[PDB]
Design a protein around this ligand. Structure first.
Ligand code: HEM
Length: 131
């Protein structure tokens, strides 16, 4: 199951120091738009939020209610944080790089499972941007 593959990988990632540090380093480096959005964010706190957020995307992919993803859609929409849909591709690229760096068993199957599993929830979030 793709969600199972992602859960196994994410366990190894969270067990590896520097995973979330590296994610944000890659994500911030990817565009000045990302740096501008996070310029007055407590990045230590944000890493905890992201850890839980990725868990929410996995729970959705395992069959939980779209309620939490709808809420993320609202919070990241144009009317709130205002996160343009194009920025999620940069988020996913940064995640995949961090996974490759921190999951010792990462292979093509792992990477495709991450893209598939995260992509489902990302689609929901993006769909609310202009709502
Ligand atoms: C699927 C991908 C994403 C997940 C799982 C995620 C998760 C979260 C969570 C849980 C929060 C805190 C609660 C909330 O507002 O919902 C948050 C806040 C925030 N997110 Fe995201 N997010 C994602 C994508 C993005 C992207 C692509 C950006 C682009 C820059 C972004 C920018 C922000 C900003 C600027 C905040 C507020 C930071 C602050 O000022 O303290 N997020 N995100």
């Amino acid at each position: 199951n793709a969600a199972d593959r992602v859960m196994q990988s994410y366990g190894r990632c969270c067990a590896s120091t520097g995973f979330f540090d590296d994610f944000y380093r890659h994500f911030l480096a990817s565009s000045p738009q990302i740096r501008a959005k996070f310029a007055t964010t407590d990045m230590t706190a944000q890493k905890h939020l992201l850890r839980a957020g990725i868990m929410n995307l996995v729970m959705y992919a395992r069959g939980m209610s779209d309620s939490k993803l709808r809420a993320l859609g609202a919070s990241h929409s144009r009317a709130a944080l205002d996160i343009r849909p194009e920025l999620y591709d940069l988020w996913l690229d940064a995640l995949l790089m961090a996974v490759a760096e921190h999951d010792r068993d990462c292979d093509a199957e792992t990477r495709d499972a991450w893209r598939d599993v995260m992509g489902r929830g990302i689609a929901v979030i993006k769909s609310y941007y202009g709502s």
